[PDB]
Symmetry: C2
Subunit: 209 residues, 2 copies
């Protein structure tokens, strides 16, 4: 019943298209719109908060969470003791997924999206050349941006989780050159070349670990 009401509550939230950060109607109103008890709606809201869909803000209200249903370590990788094995396993995933991502980006990216990719690529070069350790996080954002522009929704959700785990667990000249080759292939709308450039980058980065 609680899980069922949580489902309908989720369905109500999607139908009304509440943006991120929006305050929900109070629980008296929700319980009436769903024809359930007040205790039932209280538990259903708490179920959706546990799933990071809602944020119960004590003293204010209950809001659409910016987490959009995804926790910090959503696949439970913090419970893996053998982090060397996990790193190798995650690179195996990246080898299987990221070349297709690069191929899809070459195929569908628009000029304004490409402009933003190239700025990030330059920012990475700038930070790398300055010995600025934030380049490691910019590198993650570059791959996440490629996943977004691939147009595969599941890739967009998944690749940040994979690459963030590798980053938390854990040549610079070669990565800069690889990024330039990937951008060049995408700029020339060449999907096979983008695929191969990305494939050779991941294999090189993996070998460095």
């Amino acid at each position: 019943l609680v899980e069922q009401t949580a489902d309908r509550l989720l369905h109500l939230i999607l139908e009304r298209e509440y943006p991120v950060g929006a305050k929900l109607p109070n629980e008296y109103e929700l319980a009436e719109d769903l024809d359930v008890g007040r205790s039932t709606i209280r538990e259903a809201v708490r179920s959706l908060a546990t799933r990071n869909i809602l944020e119960v803000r004590q003293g204010s209200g209950t809001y659409i969470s910016s987490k959009k249903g995804v926790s910090e370590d959503p696949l439970g990788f913090s419970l893996i003791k053998d982090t060397d094995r996990l790193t190798s396993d995650l690179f195996e995933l990246r080898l299987l997924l990221e070349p297709r991502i690069a191929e899809l980006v070459a195929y569908r990216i628009t000029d304004d999206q490409l402009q933003l990719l190239e700025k990030l690529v330059g920012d990475i070069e700038d930070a790398v050349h300055a010995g600025d350790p934030k380049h490691l996080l910019l590198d993650v954002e570059f791959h996440s941006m490629l996943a977004k522009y691939s147009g595969n929704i599941a890739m967009d959700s998944l690749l940040p989780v994979i690459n963030q785990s590798i980053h938390l667990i854990n040549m610079k000249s070669d990565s800069l050159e690889a990024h330039r080759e990937i951008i060049k292939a995408i700029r020339e709308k060449n999907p096979v070349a983008a695929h191969d450039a990305m494939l050779m980058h991941i294999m090189s980065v993996r070998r460095s670990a």
Copy 2:
């Protein structure tokens, strides 16, 4: 500080290799072993419970959760309105991942694991033949079992989430036999191609 002690508590749980369903020592002992206050350990446990790592059972104890740090719908796919597109996108992930899983299973699986796999393959046949709709969930379990036996830890965590999401939104029988045959003959290329053909067929349906 609470989050620092939560990290230290997680480390302690991993060091001591507490299995799923094990009861933690009481919070007095936890705070003593971590050299921290009683109020800090209480919040650290709640932090780990929020992360689906621990289960706080009122009246009983705090336990290693079977969720293993992973919530229901851990990638938030329930918030995606275009379910037809998400389905096609998830099949593209399966096409890219499952053939390598089958390749790895053929390479790695042991005879006792293979017996379990073959039993599930038979259970699926029986359920399909009996018109039992539980075959759809058994099919999900078949792919999760392959991802487990692939020995890739990330695959083991990830493929159940992919296939559970597709599910929530007689050629298969023949394909399962072909895949098992390749695995039983320890033939990774044949297992790869049998799985690839099967996923492309399912996606087309």
